[PDB]
Symmetry: C4
Subunit: 327 residues, 4 copies
């Protein structure tokens, strides 16, 4: 009844508080939402359009263009047809977007106006490039990527090849592969060291074959991950009855390079002591039909009872062999 450290869906159940400070662009960019980033960029356009519009309007005002927007034989405006702020605003937009309808058109008359068109051209170009890049950042780096990996709802304890094992099933929801895929597991419980030190949650490795490289998996059809419960296992002393009492949690991990997303992935899940099914085995999901193999995923989470499974702990199992040898 303690609590869930990692949720069934992989989400971690911890919140951070009281964090100190630092007084980056790429991370900041991908962290913001679409609607806000698009609002941001449209704001960037408006502001720059309005700014230059204001400048061209000032220039026109001072030059006397407002009273002679089309010019004549004796008089040439800085920008043709700026008759007021709305016109200046339009000329700004038309310049920066590069629409350039041309009714409002810069002339050779004013160095400053020519300068301002050069500047706005460069700015408009810079802004666009930043928008193209930010849109790719948030594009190729989404926070929501759909889980490509499935863990079974339950783990189970059963005999395989003379050994009592903790077992859980992993699967790939896509035809795409996972490169250099490998698995890990941890038992999560609080504990007090013999020296009296309290460890709120201790993370204790569950051996899935790392030392022989057998934690490395080639995952096509769903695979059943195996933990042999032995002297070195944290579950060594745990019997079926201990299970309905004990408060602990097992975190399971699958890591690898997903050929779809191109990025290294960590898929997570969790089994509470109460979510482990003793004396059970998974229903087979894999079937061969003539020319081809098929996986039926509706059997993925399903299990069946194996009543011949011993109800004592692995430690009892071992100790009993040594007890009936000597006598």
């Amino acid at each position: 009844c303690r609590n869930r450290f990692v949720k069934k869906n992989g989400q971690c159940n911890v919140e951070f508080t009281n964090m100190d400070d630092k007084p980056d662009m790429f991370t900041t960019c991908v962290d913001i939402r679409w609607r806000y980033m698009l609002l941001l960029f449209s704001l960037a356009f408006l502001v720059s359009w309005l700014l230059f519009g204001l400048i061209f309007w000032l220039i026109a005002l001072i030059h006397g263009d407002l009273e002679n927007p089309g010019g004549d034989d004796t008089f040439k405006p800085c920008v043709l047809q700026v008759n007021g702020f709305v016109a200046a605003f339009l000329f700004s937009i038309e310049t920066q977007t590069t629409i350039g309808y041309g009714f409002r058109c810069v002339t050779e008359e004013c160095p400053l106006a020519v300068f301002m068109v050069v500047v706005q051209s460069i700015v408009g170009c810079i802004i666009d490039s930043f928008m193209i890049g930010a849109i790719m950042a948030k594009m190729a780096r989404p926070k929501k990527r759909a889980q490509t990996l499935l863990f079974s709802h339950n783990a189970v304890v059963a005999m395989r090849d003379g050994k009592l094992c903790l077992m859980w099933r992993v699967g790939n929801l896509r035809k795409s592969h996972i490169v250099e895929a490998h698995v890990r597991a941890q038992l999560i419980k609080p504990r007090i060291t013999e020296e009296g030190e309290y460890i709120p949650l201790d993370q204790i490795d569950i051996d899935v074959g790392f030392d022989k490289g057998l934690d490395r998996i080639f995952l096509v059809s769903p695979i059943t991950i195996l933990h042999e419960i032995n002297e070195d296992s944290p579950l060594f002393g745990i019997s079926r009855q201990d299970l309905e009492t004990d408060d602990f949690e097992i975190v399971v991990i699958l890591e690898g390079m997903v050929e779809a997303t191109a990025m290294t992935t960590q898929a997570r899940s969790s089994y509470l002591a109460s979510e482990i099914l003793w004396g059970h085995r998974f229903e087979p999901v894999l079937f061969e039909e003539k020319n081809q193999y098929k996986v039926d995923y509706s059997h993925f989470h399903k299990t069946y009872e194996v009543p011949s499974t011993p109800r004592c702990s692995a430690k009892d199992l071992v100790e009993n062999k040594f007890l009936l040898s000597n006598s």
Copy 2:
């Protein structure tokens, strides 16, 4: 005669069925075909062009512009020269593309029309950016990348340095390298555990040197991968005659970071029991000519018989030594 789990070309022979649900953009993007994605984008242009065209047409209609498109001394249209829907449509296109010929040109007269030009400018800019990004997504993340790695058509069993070995050849088709390249192999067969549990396809590691780090290869010219068949090998009890009987499959893997594609790669192949050549050795592909080394790839798949190869299993080989020692 059972069936092929992995095809010679690396393709996996399994199909998934009965999958449950989830109710992403980047993955969705790269999964669609070119012609459809290009059709999609052209559709995006049409729709937005038609939409704004419709809006400018409504504005023109209500303002009375249709009857005075060029305006006069007493009357100024919202957008010059919109005389009907085709003209409005053109003005829309010309605005969003930023072509801006200028015959059809927005004026200062109508706040709403100016507003709409601003909006369309932003939208056109957003659309373009998404097209530039999607085209890179599908660009830098192709599904068809040409296999850069070659496995020999056959594996073989022969003596090397006093040991009976399973051997197969791998090669790089490019001058480009593979960083942190390493190999793996698995024997694939169904089996029943002593407890009566049926495993439709069990995946059993074939030791290629992982424990000594010898599974790690520096691949320039083709290399012959070696599996010593010993007590711990699944092939320990298999003789030449067992081979023409037995139903099983060996999957071979090569993983590494391809310096060409920049992405971590898994190259796969398969050898059926019937595709393993007992008492054979690969023809050498590597030759030194004066100043330089050359590889002749026409010898890559070729093998020759070594009649002195023992036809008994490795287990017989060992057991026989112990049988002629003691006597």
Copy 3:
């Protein structure tokens, strides 16, 4: 009092000198600062605008356009309305930016002028593309990325589970995870080999569990890294009093794939002999409140004394057991 090889913040304290030579674009690009890269691109625009402007001006000059910019019935200019260098300059800008107001407009009259517009169009397009790319390079590859990982200010020496240990704490400042995270540590001191060879700084591994795969960590809430001090440890012979004398440094590393930045990361820190707190333990940062777990980061760096901690070295600790056994 020797010196700091690695700073507390991970920065390395070494400078390179007397480096020889090589007589790339992507690296060169990301190495330059924003303001200089933006200045660079604006310079690229100016230069190309000025160049073509000069060319159109020459063409106009030679054709006689300067004296008849608008043309007439008997005479057609190469580019309409180029009346001087400022006009030519404007036409250049208007062409390359694709603003194209159209008052200055190329005609069918001069093959060379048409040619030049084609060329400038291609160049302007090339320049833009390079600017869009460079801006992404520097965008997705920043030098300043905010440290996502925290090391405790101090390490400590205390008993855990019957063993004297060197301990330090690591933490993730973000809810984002670290894929395939693992840790390392080194003792840095100069030394002289028995053969008389001087090694200015020798880097000696501190065992954090690599051989059992226990150097691999699943990091959610802060974790305390453990080095058991034993026969094989460089700290085996070091007591509490040796600590206030000895001159040495311990470098701690955490490597992994950060799910935020998408890139493989190396976080670093350092503990001088004087920064190690003997007979101390870290304050717990992790607390369970009902439905959820919380981390209080204000306790991250904090420690408390454990007076029962032995002040002798691990070697003394061992040797003393063997001394009181035999008697």
Copy 4:
């Protein structure tokens, strides 16, 4: 005198011949040279500009526009001011580039002409996007990236800590780090197995500490890589005199994730038997000056003689100890 398998600069000395076939875009793109890719894109522009120009010219021809380009009260051209092929060509360019000067301007008159402007707009947009992407491909994936890692010109054999060792030096030419850096080495020679099989070049691991994880290095200042020559070493039986006779090659590798280029890297070099200096040691490159450490890279390749170095092989060294024990 045999030959060089790997050049001092890391380049591999092998050429492939007689390769079979496959009947991708991203790889193909980055493989082509700049000048050709830029020529390619400019060709793409020309072709599309010429094509549509031809179409608008046909349309104009058939409509009768060539004889009335400006139109009048009773007659409206499909595109204003197309008076011939040069004009049509200009209108094409002006449309696709989106310059849109506007002297040549499409009208509402011809559905086909409007259609063609829509099509060309989409095509021009597609072409541009492909150019922006290809330029990034070749941008972020260069073939020439400057070597960031240096190997010493020579290896050496000397005693360190009671053991005869093969040694070579590696260094980072940049302040940038290498994440998860690790080293490897191989002895390359042809050999004949006891069964009579010829291996043109056999690649035999040289143990740099892989089993203890000591092949993993934290590289700041140059480091001297160590191979202890022992029973399991291929160099076990090699003395100083054997060195001036023997024909063999040692390939050295350094792999890691370069924080600069963001990509996993393999740096390579080679030492011929003749390039190994027996009874030598590297000059120290690292020096501490007060507040800071410095590396002098002009000492990087330099070595000095250690006359006390034994000239016999490691095997002799061992065997001699056992010879003077027993007597």
